[PDB]
Amino acid sequence: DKTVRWCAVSEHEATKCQSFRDHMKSVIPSDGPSVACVKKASYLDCIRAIAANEADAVTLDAGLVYDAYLAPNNLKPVVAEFYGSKEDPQTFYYAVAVVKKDSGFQMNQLRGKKSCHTGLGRSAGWNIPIGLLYCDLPEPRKPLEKAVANFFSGSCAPCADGTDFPQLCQLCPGCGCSTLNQYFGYSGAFKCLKDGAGDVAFVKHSTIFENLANKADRDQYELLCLDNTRKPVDEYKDCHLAQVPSHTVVARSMGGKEDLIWELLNQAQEHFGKDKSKEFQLFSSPHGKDLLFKDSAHGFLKVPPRMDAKMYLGYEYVTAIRNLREGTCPECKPVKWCALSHHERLKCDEWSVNSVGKIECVSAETTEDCIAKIMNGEADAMSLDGGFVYIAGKCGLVPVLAENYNAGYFAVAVVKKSASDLTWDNLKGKKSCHTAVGRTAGWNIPMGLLYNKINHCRFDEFFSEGCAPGSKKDSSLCKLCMGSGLNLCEPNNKEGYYGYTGAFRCLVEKGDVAFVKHQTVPQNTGGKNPDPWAKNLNEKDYELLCLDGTRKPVEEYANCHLARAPNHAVVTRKDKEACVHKILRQQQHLFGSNSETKDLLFRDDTVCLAKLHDRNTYEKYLGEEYVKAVGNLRKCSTSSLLEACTFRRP
Ligand SMILES: [Fe+3]
């Protein structure tokens, strides 16, 4: 059967689920999804039912999405409700801390201030901010209200126990837990800030825009960012306490039935969603409000399949809620490097013991997996080609240090000297060799420039065929690759045409043009590479294509390159930027210019790890022209990590 067992948490919900069930049968054909209805006592019982394979799907708030993820439940987000409208779907809100312009303090200076909260137990106004501040609170941290009462000098915390903790009600005596209290709710807590009762209001990104129509007034307010800087109120995407999904359908991590759940809900919205005007409506009920889904919902969006709960909720949210649940606080130290192979891990392990605890190791199977571990705190750092820096950046990470070899390396187009027809001005129908799709030298620069000439990124229809590792297996740009079985066209070492050397090899054996870096040909000719494919080559037999339309010798790269590559760079989270900057310079003065295979963790061209100063953003580090190019190449991107991050921040 293709049945989705929907979990209801009340009798009114099960009634709506049964109506849902019955109406779907009229509009979905026999080979299509159907609905079964399971009634449990609570959200938590539903989570357990689904983990136990007694049900399949339930829609949850953020907090319960977190509970659902924890062992032994192991559920994940699969479909999101959206709001507002189809043109600009709203899936998330942002919890923010709003303050007055010129009030003279940062997030790490909130102790002693006056706070305005929407209400005790509410997410944006209490659980998140207090969650994030948890370890700043004085001991004993239980009971929580007492500890908060002794952190802020006074507050309005609606619904708090002012009798036992009067500080929490200084700004709203009684701590009224209703609209009768002028400082209750989102508009209430903002008002508490605006009227000068408090110094900080813990509310939503939209709260200020709903209460202040004129920009001139909003310019008198700012937001506290967790890096202890301030930003304008319309920049909440880069300055929030947490990003929070409004309502999320979850399901088993393995065994599903993700695709069935989406097929069901997508067809349900199409026949019974917003403004469909049938007797049955998905987003309302005669039996009650917010049954199964929120009545305000306008539809559903499929959650990208790479997404897990921690990535969906985000690192900020998870930190906040972890603190609340676990109640654990520390008493700088170990940087967790991410390895991508057994040989990367072996160098890392012996680095760890050589560093004396200062460095530790974690491994993942691909770069993206390693990036995701950095985003969620399972790891802290790794070094990346410019193309992965962009992806890391879109995913919220920052570059901290750049690999130096000597402005960085040159991306060049290599060709065989014999075939003296080839020029940059027309490579249409020729055979191309790339390091990998999405890398600086192999793709982003050359195809970036190419995009401007042809105005599309279907490069498998420009070149006759090629090898560009990471392409779709049925693409003409996997035809020249050499990997066997499942390894064919894979962006890793089991594919011999992957990477700088690989792409040059590809040119030598099969291609017409290879997109690599300036030192690749010199290093793989003249006997320096002893492998049979390179041993007997000399660099004089290869030439570079210049932007002119002319050609030049390989040593002449400085006047015959496509563009300057931004260097490979170490990336991490903003909250570890300082510690990573410190520990690596302290480690490279000990183990720098003063791997057992090739280019493990860092390139072997790397002489030092260099300061970035003001270029600690992916946009500022890569430069605008590089970012523009990659932007245009996304239209044809197949990176599932990038798809997941962009779902959360388009
Ligand atoms: Fe590179």
Side-chain angles (χ1 to χ4, degrees):
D1 61 33
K2 305 227 301 151
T3 159
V4 176
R5 295 166 301 174
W6 203 277
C7 199
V9 305
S10 72
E11 289 183 359
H12 297 332
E13 283 203 340
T15 306
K16 180 172 180 182
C17 182
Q18 290 162 336
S19 198
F20 180 32
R21 188 227 285 120
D22 292 351
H23 284 86
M24 283 297 103
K25 296 196 167 294
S26 322
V27 312
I28 283 161
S30 50
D31 62 32
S34 71
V35 180
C37 302
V38 179
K39 199 257 151 181
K40 294 294 175 175
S42 75
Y43 286 117
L44 223 63
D45 286 318
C46 274
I47 283 162
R48 260 113 62 159
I50 297 170
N53 202 18
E54 309 182 353
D56 300 311
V58 70
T59 323
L60 300 178
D61 289 355
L64 288 148
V65 169
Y66 181 73
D67 298 331
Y69 147 72
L70 291 176
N73 304 313
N74 312 123
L75 311 186
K76 66 177 175 176
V78 294
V79 176
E81 278 175 36
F82 77 89
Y83 305 86
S85 168
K86 198 182 193 296
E87 332 303 310
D88 182 39
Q90 310 291 305
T91 294
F92 299 86
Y93 68 90
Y94 294 91
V96 298
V98 187
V99 294
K100 298 267 211 179
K101 174 66 76 68
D102 308 321
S103 54
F105 67 89
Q106 299 296 350
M107 190 83 64
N108 59 3
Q109 292 176 301
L110 281 176
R111 188 167 67 187
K113 306 295 177 296
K114 292 185 281 151
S115 58
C116 311
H117 309 270
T118 58
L120 186 131
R122 291 192 178 197
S123 297
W126 184 265
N127 304 332
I128 289 163
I130 301 308
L132 297 166
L133 295 159
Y134 188 78
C135 294
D136 289 343
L137 304 176
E139 299 182 295
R141 288 180 261 247
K142 283 199 257 270
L144 192 54
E145 289 182 67
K146 190 181 181 169
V148 174
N150 283 289
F151 182 78
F152 297 115
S153 50
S155 305
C156 180
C159 324
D161 181 6
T163 311
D164 294 308
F165 317 111
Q167 294 95 347
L168 294 182
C169 310
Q170 179 193 338
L171 311 184
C172 55
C175 280
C177 193
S178 75
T179 53
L180 285 150
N181 168 7
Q182 63 171 357
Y183 299 151
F184 182 71
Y186 280 114
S187 53
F190 179 73
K191 189 180 192 309
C192 168
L193 170 64
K194 171 158 141 284
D195 298 356
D199 301 306
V200 61
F202 299 110
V203 291
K204 260 172 35 179
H205 70 286
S206 55
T207 306
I208 194 169
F209 299 92
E210 294 165 334
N211 296 275
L212 284 183
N214 288 346
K215 215 226 169 203
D217 299 320
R218 297 189 231 107
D219 289 351
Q220 291 298 110
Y221 297 78
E222 295 179 298
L223 304 177
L224 303 175
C225 326
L226 296 168
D227 73 353
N228 305 309
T229 62
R230 290 185 172 204
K231 279 179 165 44
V233 297
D234 66 338
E235 293 189 41
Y236 50 85
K237 286 174 180 181
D238 308 291
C239 190
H240 56 259
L241 303 190
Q243 177 171 1
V244 190
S246 301
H247 223 219
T248 305
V249 186
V250 307
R252 277 171 260 108
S253 289
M254 283 107 74
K257 305 145 175 182
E258 307 98 54
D259 288 350
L260 215 59
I261 293 161
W262 164 249
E263 184 185 357
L264 169 73
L265 293 178
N266 189 40
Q267 292 183 64
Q269 70 181 325
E270 177 58 19
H271 294 111
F272 300 117
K274 181 62 181 153
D275 302 312
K276 291 287 174 291
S277 300
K278 314 286 180 55
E279 69 167 357
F280 176 75
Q281 304 191 342
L282 201 58
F283 302 123
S284 72
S285 181
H287 298 100
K289 198 171 162 298
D290 293 335
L291 304 179
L292 306 181
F293 312 106
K294 282 181 198 322
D295 282 7
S296 57
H298 285 43
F300 298 120
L301 291 172
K302 194 185 160 65
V303 174
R306 185 55 186 77
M307 200 87 66
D308 79 86
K310 290 192 288 191
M311 190 183 297
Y312 198 60
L313 298 167
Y315 177 78
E316 283 73 28
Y317 185 86
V318 175
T319 299
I321 200 174
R322 281 252 278 181
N323 287 339
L324 289 178
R325 272 130 200 281
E326 303 181 8
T328 302
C329 293
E331 303 186 303
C332 169
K333 207 60 183 293
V335 177
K336 290 190 290 302
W337 204 269
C338 206
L340 294 178
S341 62
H342 193 64
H343 273 94
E344 276 210 341
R345 181 50 179 274
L346 281 177
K347 172 151 94 159
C348 188
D349 278 326
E350 72 174 316
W351 183 17
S352 186
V353 68
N354 277 321
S355 69
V356 195
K358 231 84 177 74
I359 299 293
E360 290 190 323
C361 302
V362 133
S363 56
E365 290 162 294
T366 72
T367 294
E368 292 192 350
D369 292 340
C370 260
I371 289 177
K373 292 200 173 199
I374 293 175
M375 296 161 52
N376 70 22
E378 281 178 10
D380 298 331
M382 68 191 302
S383 187
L384 293 171
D385 161 63
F388 276 130
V389 178
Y390 175 85
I391 292 181
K394 285 295 187 184
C395 293
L397 301 185
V398 294
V400 285
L401 292 175
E403 295 190 9
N404 276 8
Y405 66 84
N406 192 289
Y409 67 88
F410 291 104
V412 298
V414 190
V415 297
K416 186 77 192 304
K417 186 164 174 191
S418 60
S420 54
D421 333 75
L422 299 183
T423 73
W424 183 239
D425 291 0
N426 206 2
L427 298 174
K428 182 183 173 62
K430 304 290 141 49
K431 300 180 167 99
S432 62
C433 297
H434 307 259
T435 59
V437 47
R439 313 297 174 81
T440 298
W443 193 262
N444 294 340
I445 291 166
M447 300 308 96
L449 293 170
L450 189 42
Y451 182 90
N452 297 328
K453 301 177 165 196
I454 62 175
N455 308 344
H456 64 84
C457 47
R458 299 111 54 189
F459 299 110
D460 56 329
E461 298 178 329
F462 182 81
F463 301 112
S464 46
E465 58 187 358
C467 181
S471 301
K472 318 210 307 191
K473 303 298 183 158
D474 67 342
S475 179
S476 74
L477 298 178
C478 289
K479 261 62 151 85
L480 301 184
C481 299
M482 65 168 277
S484 26
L486 300 179
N487 308 304
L488 184 58
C489 209
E490 212 60 62
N492 67 60
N493 286 331
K494 276 118 73 176
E495 166 60 59
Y497 293 175
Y498 162 73
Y500 295 117
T501 306
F504 175 56
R505 179 181 180 167
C506 172
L507 168 64
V508 172
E509 296 169 327
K510 306 192 193 160
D512 298 316
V513 62
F515 300 110
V516 297
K517 61 175 187 188
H518 70 277
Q519 59 251 106
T520 296
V521 175
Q523 286 169 2
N524 291 284
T525 57
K528 293 167 215 177
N529 186 338
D531 291 345
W533 71 266
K535 185 168 185 186
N536 203 51
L537 307 175
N538 55 72
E539 76 181 68
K540 305 154 174 172
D541 294 319
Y542 298 93
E543 289 194 319
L544 305 182
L545 307 175
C546 326
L547 295 174
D548 275 333
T550 73
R551 328 210 318 182
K552 288 196 204 308
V554 158
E555 269 194 330
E556 220 86 66
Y557 58 83
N559 292 251
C560 190
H561 59 263
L562 299 180
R564 199 107 207 194
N567 278 335
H568 290 200
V570 175
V571 306
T572 190
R573 301 180 301 282
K574 289 184 205 166
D575 79 323
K576 267 192 176 276
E577 170 180 45
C579 272
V580 174
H581 198 286
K582 190 205 296 179
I583 293 297
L584 300 190
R585 281 188 53 190
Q586 181 259 297
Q587 284 281 305
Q588 85 178 327
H589 196 63
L590 290 167
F591 308 115
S593 305
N594 169 223
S595 41
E596 250 196 330
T597 307
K598 35 194 276 287
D599 308 305
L600 275 43
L601 285 49
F602 318 93
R603 304 311 296 190
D604 294 324
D605 290 357
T606 299
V607 302
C608 70
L609 294 175
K611 294 167 56 53
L612 300 182
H613 297 118
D614 189 49
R615 308 198 305 144
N616 50 5
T617 301
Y618 83 90
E619 293 129 295
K620 287 185 293 177
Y621 181 68
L622 300 174
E624 42 211 348
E625 192 79 335
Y626 188 97
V627 173
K628 287 170 68 194
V630 178
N632 284 357
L633 295 178
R634 298 225 308 202
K635 305 181 204 313
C636 305
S637 168
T638 60
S639 170
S640 75
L641 178 61
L642 183 54
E643 190 191 3
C645 300
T646 52
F647 184 87
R648 303 216 321 142
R649 201 211 195 294

